[PDB]
């Protein structure tokens, strides 16, 4: 049993070949039959995840249960993900949190990020920055330790709705300014030197200002900057490599393993993985979810992707209320999400469709000369709106001219 698990890890760490990785798991899958409690948790996360073992969601649920009855943090975390996403099992947010709490209790780090994110965006619970400070803190300590050892493995951020040294020494200098190395400590001026180190892109500085805005040192402790500084540290763990395992599944034609390897990171609180896990459900390529639970589940992950500051997720939340995707048709509700992507994020399309609801009298009362403003505002915001406003303004004047003739 235990001898079989050693052969798999040797070939996994020794060979990067796809066949050799699958050949290494053959002993690991056989060791799962011997109920070695370390063996299943490496094949549980392949039986339901894919791009490793073949994907079979029903084959992983029942053996997750014995992982829960054993009391495994890696089993308590994932069984909450099944009931949070309604994946192969009837959806229930009521005890989705119960499994995540015991996973967060059990020492798992994924169940702390999700519980922290649920406390931060107010999803499933009350938005409490105090509770969102506690759970996001435990992840940050367990990821800031490993980056200093692993060197900070950077992973590209790929959004499908868009396509388909010098500062390292400044961190130690800013650490000595706040603490005091041969000089009196000054929290008023050490803040500016430490905050400028994070603009270089290194996330070690991102950690140190989060504690600075937590205890109240230097600047007064505000909740909004307490966890938002914490969150970008937590979004770069060893689970940040999991876009690539999901994105390769999308390019390899296995679209149903790019909607399960993305729905975990959508539950983990991303925006690259919350638009993409909804864009795949947008075009109905997924097959585990039914044909009637494809748009309401893609509405949920378009709604979370908008509140985290995405332009397209605020236009595409207007579309789903414009046509009637997953909701009874609401021209008034779709109106607001189109303007909220106009004044805030200055999305060029988002004032063109503002003109259409102004020009054709949808949602609000019609006014011809108010619509002219937003078409004109569209051409100022972008170079690509010069064309599709001009054929819209010509159509606009035809109605104005034809109405004047009838009078």
């Amino acid at each position: 049993a235990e001898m079989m698990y050693q052969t798999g890890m040797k070939i996994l760490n020794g060979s990067n070949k796809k066949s050799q990785k699958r050949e290494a798991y053959r002993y690991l899958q056989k060791a799962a039959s011997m109920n070695h409690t370390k063996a299943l948790e490496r094949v549980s996360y392949a039986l339901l995840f894919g791009d490793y073992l073949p994907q079979n969601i029903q084959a992983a649920r029942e053996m997750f249960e014995k992982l829960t009855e054993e009391g495994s943090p890696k089993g308590q975390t994932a069984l909450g993900f099944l009931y949070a996403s309604g994946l192969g099992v009837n959806s229930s947010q009521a005890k989705a949190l119960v499994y995540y709490t015991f996973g967060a209790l059990g020492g798992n780090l994924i169940a702390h990020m999700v519980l922290g994110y649920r406390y931060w965006a107010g999803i499933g619970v009350l938005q409490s920055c105090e509770s969102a400070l506690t759970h996001y803190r435990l992840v940050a300590n367990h990821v800031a330790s490993d980056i200093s050892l692993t060197g900070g493995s950077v992973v590209q951020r790929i959004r499908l709705p868009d396509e388909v040294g010098w500062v390292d020494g400044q961190l130690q200098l800013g650490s000595m300014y706040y603490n005091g190395i041969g000089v009196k400590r000054d929290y008023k001026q050490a803040l500016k030197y430490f905050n400028l180190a994070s603009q270089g892109g290194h996330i070690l500085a991102f950690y140190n200002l989060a504690q600075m805005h937590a205890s109240g040192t230097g600047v007064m402790r505000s909740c909004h900057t307490a966890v938002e500084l914490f969150k970008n540290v937590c979004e770069r763990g060893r689970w940040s490599e999991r876009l690539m395992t999901a994105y390769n599944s999308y390019k390899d034609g296995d679209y149903n393993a790019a909607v399960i390897q993305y729905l975990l990171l959508a539950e983990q609180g991303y925006e690259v993985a919350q638009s993409n896990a909804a864009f795949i459900l947008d075009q109905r390529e997924a097959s585990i979810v039914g044909e009637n639970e494809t748009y309401p589940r893609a509405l949920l992950h378009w709604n979370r992707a908008a509140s985290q500051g995405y332009t397209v997720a605020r236009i595409k939340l207007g579309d789903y209320h414009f046509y009637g995707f997953g909701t009874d048709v609401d021209y008034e509700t779709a109106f607001i999400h189109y303007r909220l992507a106009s004044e805030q994020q200055h999305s060029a399309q988002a004032m063109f469709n503002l003109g259409y609801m102004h020009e054709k009298g949808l949602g609000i009362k019609q006014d011809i000369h108010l619509a002219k403003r937003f078409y004109d505002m569209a051409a100022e915001a972008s170079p690509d709106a010069q064309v599709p406003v001009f054929l819209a303004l010509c159509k606009l004047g035809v109605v104005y001219f034809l109405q004047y003739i009838r009078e």
């Binding site: 829960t68 009855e69 054993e70 009391g71 495994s72 943090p73 309604g86 959806s91 947010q93 009521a94 005890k95 949190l97 119960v98 709490t101 015991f102 209790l105 059990g106 020492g107 965006a121 107010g122 999803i123 499933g124 619970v125 009350l126 400070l133 506690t134 803190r137 435990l138 937590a214 205890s215 639970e293 309401p296 589940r297 949920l300 709604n303 979370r304 008034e332 509700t333 607001i336 999400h337 303007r339 909220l340 004044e343 609000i364 009362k365 006014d367 000369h369 108010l370």
Partner: protein
């Protein structure tokens, strides 16, 4: 799944001898789960029926009419203004809305393009979609502004929108127009949050009580060391 990111939850640990409440949310004896921690600790954590229906909160209010709350704001004459990319809206609560923008000449002159949008010479509270949410409001509608060339020299009109916020300091979320030369202003104030029908609506919290099986104590052995750890860190 349908609008599921608005339902709050809370896990509690009431212990062994606990009786589920018969008031509030509904409960069942079948929807229980048997739990196990990392240090082999058995818990039975029950969950309520997620309905949270009706409005049976015993809504009573013997206080003043909502007209009387904004009177101290009117007499103090402390009124704010808002900046934009170009324009500048100065709503004055109880006097006027003023929209203007300064044209700074090259060295000596400042030119003002000003407009006037108003001047002060039912068992259901109406609600407007605010970012897609449900907030009941106080409308204060008013007109006789400057004449509007598009409406053939008609004076502008405007409605004042009042919604409550606890940390507000009398600012504006946004200024918007429902039609040409007739504008809508939203105003944040802390006065209306005391009104039960005008306060910010929060959904009732469905409580997850959970009972401690024998062989396990009142709270798990991997839990209480963490809330004291953040208490030290604060």
């Amino acid at each position: 799944p349908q609008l599921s990111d608005d339902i709050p939850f809370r896990v509690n640990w009431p212990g062994t001898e606990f009786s589920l409440p018969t008031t509030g949310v509904l409960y069942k004896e079948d929807n229980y789960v048997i739990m196990t921690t990392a240090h082999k600790e058995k818990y039975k954590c029950i969950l309520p029926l997620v309905t949270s229906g009706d409005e049976e909160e015993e809504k009573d209010y013997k206080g003043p009419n909502p007209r009387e709350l904004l009177e101290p704001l009117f007499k103090q004459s402390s009124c704010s203004y808002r900046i934009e990319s170009y324009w500048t809206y100065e709503v004055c609560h109880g006097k006027h809305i003023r929209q203007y923008h300064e044209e700074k000449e090259t060295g000596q002159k400042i030119n003002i393009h000003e407009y006037y949008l108003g001047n002060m010479l039912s068992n259901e509270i109406p609600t407007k979609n605010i970012e897609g949410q449900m907030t009941p409001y106080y409308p204060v509608g008013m007109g006789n502004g400057t004449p509007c060339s598009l409406k053939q020299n008609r004076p502008r009109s405007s409605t004042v929108m009042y919604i409550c916020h606890p940390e507000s300091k009398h600012e504006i979320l946004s200024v918007a127009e429902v039609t040409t030369c007739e504008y809508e202003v939203v105003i944040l104030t802390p006065l209306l949050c005391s009104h039960p029908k005008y306060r910010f609506r929060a959904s009732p919290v469905n409580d997850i009580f959970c009972q401690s099986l024998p062989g396990s104590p009142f709270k798990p052995l991997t839990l209480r060391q963490l809330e004291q750890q953040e208490e030290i860190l604060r």
